[PDB]
Amino acid sequence: CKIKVIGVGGGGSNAVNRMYEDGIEGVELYAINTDVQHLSTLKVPNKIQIGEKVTRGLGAGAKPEVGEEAALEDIDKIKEILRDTDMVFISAGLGGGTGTGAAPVIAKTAKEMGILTVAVATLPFRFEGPRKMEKALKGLEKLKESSDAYIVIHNDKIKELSNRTLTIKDAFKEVDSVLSKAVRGITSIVVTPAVINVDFADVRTTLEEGGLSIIGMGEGRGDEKADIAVEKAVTSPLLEGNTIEGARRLLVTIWTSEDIPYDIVDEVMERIHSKVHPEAEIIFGAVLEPQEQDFIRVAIVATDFPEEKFQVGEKEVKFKVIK
Ligand SMILES: Nc1nc2c(ncn2[C@@H]2O[C@H](COP(=O)(O)OP(=O)(O)O)[C@@H](O)[C@H]2O)c(=O)[nH]1
């Protein structure tokens, strides 16, 4: 099956760049930007400019309306890259211009072509200020209209799960790491020879029209690794305000070190089912984690929530109308 990952804007491009560096296989990678200089810095195989006319290649100046116009003017370029595609991940850092503005356009284009359309969207760190968060949430409201499922990851939650960072560079490197794990978790159980593969048809039934999606990951080592990893994953969502135990459809990836047999999946899936919604439809795959030993990582993508709401800091977020 044909999977593409498209980074939109600087943050999205950087995340996809990390996925390339992390060795994502069996998928085609693209970076789309209005900022031609940023594109020039990337290792991503396919670099695509949008908005030459309106931006002259100098970026969107953090204005979502400009990112939107860039994508609309060059919608032919976007359609071209989307031809012959089963699934696309649209990776964007919400809160800037290009990602915020163009991501909904690209997502809509893909979804109208019948491609399974999964946005992977971040909300900014608190250190980025109130205005970037406002812009992000406004853009998210458009992106949700355009997507099958939209995975929303709040950068402040990421911050919590790793070591204190001392440079903005390192803060974002951890964001890239997490996004890369989230996406590679899904692609690798479909398009590589995995420990337990899942059919693309199952990924589609799990995520199609899923809406708001929330990820949680947890590592387990040693004798009780299953219980430990599942507990950590269910209790560590990357977005507050909608517990994973409420989702009606879930996609679980169990990363295993080479020394762990596949039947660890038995205990994992028992534990997940005990913790989450009794009626949840859950698909799961398993894939090797290199350089690890006596190790699993349970990565849970939860979707199809009763209410498409969430919390960021002290703000409870609800959108105007859920399709
Ligand atoms: N994952 C990741 N996110 C980033 C990075 N740099 C910035 N961001 C996030 O992306 C959001 C938008 O910034 P950016 O993508 O540069 O703006 P755009 O190019 O106009 O879309 C920011 O508010 C950050 O939260 C990065 O290197 N990696």
Curated annotation (Swiss-Prot):
Disulfide bonds: none
Sequence positions that bind GTP: 10-14, 97-99, 128, 132, 176
Keyword Nucleotide-binding applies: yes
GO cellular component: cell division site; cytoplasm
Keyword Ribonucleoprotein in annotation: no
Pfam families tied to this protein: FtsZ_C (PF12327), Tubulin (PF00091)
InterPro entries: Cell_div_FtsZ, Cell_div_FtsZ_CS, FtsZ/CetZ, FtsZ_C, Tub_FtsZ_C, Tubulin/FtsZ-like_C, Tubulin/FtsZ_2-layer-sand-dom, Tubulin/FtsZ_GTPase_sf
Residues that span the membrane, as ranges: none
Single GO molecular function: GTPase activity
Keywords carried by this UniProt record: Cell cycle, Cell division, Cytoplasm, GTP-binding, Nucleotide-binding, Septation
Main location: cytoplasm
One of the GO biological process terms: FtsZ-dependent cytokinesis
Location(s) in or outside the cell: Cytoplasm
Subunit structure: Homodimer. Polymerizes to form a dynamic ring structure in a strictly GTP-dependent manner. Interacts directly with several other division proteins.
NCBIfam families: ftsZ
Role this protein plays: Essential cell division protein that forms a contractile ring structure (Z ring) at the future cell division site. The regulation of the ring assembly controls the timing and the location of cell division. One of the functions of the FtsZ ring is to recruit other cell division proteins to the septum to produce a new cell wall between the dividing cells. Binds GTP and shows GTPase activity.
Family recorded in the similarity comment: Belongs to the FtsZ family.
UniProt cross-references to PANTHER family, sorted A to Z: CELL DIVISION PROTEIN FTSZ-RELATED, MITOCHONDRIAL DIVISION PROTEIN FSZA
Protein name (database record): Cell division protein FtsZ
Organism: Aquifex aeolicus (strain VF5)
Higher taxonomy: Bacteria, Pseudomonadati, Aquificota, Aquificia, Aquificales
